[PDB]
Amino acid sequence: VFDEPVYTVNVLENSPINTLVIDLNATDPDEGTNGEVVYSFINFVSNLTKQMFKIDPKTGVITVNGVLDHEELHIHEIDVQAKDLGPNSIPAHCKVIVNVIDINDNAPEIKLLSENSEMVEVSENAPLGYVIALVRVSDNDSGANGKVQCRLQGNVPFRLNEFESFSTLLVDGRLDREQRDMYNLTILAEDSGYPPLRSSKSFAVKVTDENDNPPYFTKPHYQAMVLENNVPGAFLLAVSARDPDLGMNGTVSYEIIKSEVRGMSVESYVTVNSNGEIYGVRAFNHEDTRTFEFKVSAKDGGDPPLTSNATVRIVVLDVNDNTPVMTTPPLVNGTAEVSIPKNAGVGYLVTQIKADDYDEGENGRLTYSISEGDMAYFEIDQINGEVRTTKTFGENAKPSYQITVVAHDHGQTSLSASAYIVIYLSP
Ligand SMILES: [Ca+2]
Ligand SMILES: [Ca+2]
Ligand SMILES: [Ca+2]
Ligand SMILES: [Ca+2]
Ligand SMILES: [Ca+2]
Ligand SMILES: [Ca+2]
Ligand SMILES: [Ca+2]
Ligand SMILES: [Ca+2]
Ligand SMILES: [Ca+2]
Ligand code: NA
């Protein structure tokens, strides 16, 4: 018969094999008994127990024959028997209990609930306290060996809120992609064993792009000078807008706003390249339009897209592309007849010549001269065009005088237009 009915023993988790759990004696014959004892396990409460322990059948010494895992099973209940060969006897049997004492063999486990596994992401300037990923820390031991706290690290714009079940990782700042497209976090964790076993976990935070900026122009108002009578399809000016966003959000497409210039349309005067290049679609003419301005848009692919527009002033410069035009006196094939008294004095105003020129400035300025003919008997004012007599006529003066007035301008190469004034002396 066994010394005690029930035995309780504490055994370290993960104790090596052949560790002495206990040496039982079935009270080997006291004052005699038939003798030749034999020990054996006859039953286990959990069958798992079968494979963790062993007993010498003759000496009666229980030892470890397996890995005692507290997280698997912590209590082992063994029914054991001692026998005298059944000559004329009963079997004695007691109940052994091995408590598996928990030790700190599991350190913390840090897990991220997100969709794209391990790719944590968040859109620019997402709001303060916007949850990005649920983190879950665990330690599979019991007690202090099971308890755990964890913390973010280094200054970053995020934080964690510890809860009963799990923690939560959220935004704690303003995120701008144009400034930073990524952060590099490290969650540090540890258990409360002695000494405490620690875990780190490092991972990335990809800040996803928003279409939060439009294409910025280099200038709000561009200007360019052109020369009059330019060729159709001749380059004028380049504008440029850049968008800091990603892809479609940041591509740039140029458009010219509908406007009418002098009664038609911008298109009919000007067009735009999808590269910010402005081409003259027509031959410009300073006498029609010395200046016109227009707006030019820029847009990007986003839902919905965004715009910036800039103004464009075109200065049309003057060239001397208008020869002057004789308009007084009226002209037949470019000549006029006038009459005058023969006894006319000196200074008599014969006629007054005048021309119009459309160009502006020097290009448009007129000077009058007698080019040829009876330049001796008449004189012309350089600015008026007033033709007057410079001599008296009498006694066998010819009765008819021919003079060629011209009006020329002041351009790089001066243009001009003549007229033939015939003078007849009416007595
Ligand atoms: Ca274990
Ligand atoms: Ca353990
Ligand atoms: Ca632990
Ligand atoms: Ca931004
Ligand atoms: Ca952006
Ligand atoms: Ca944009
Ligand atoms: Ca012109
Ligand atoms: Ca002119
Ligand atoms: Ca002109
Ligand atoms: Na023994």
TrEMBL record:
Domain Cadherin: 3-110, 114-217, 218-326, 332-427
Highest rank taxon of the organism: Eukaryota
Intracellular or extracellular location(s): Cell membrane
Official protein name in the record: Protocadherin-19
Full-protein interval shown: 228 to 654 of 1078
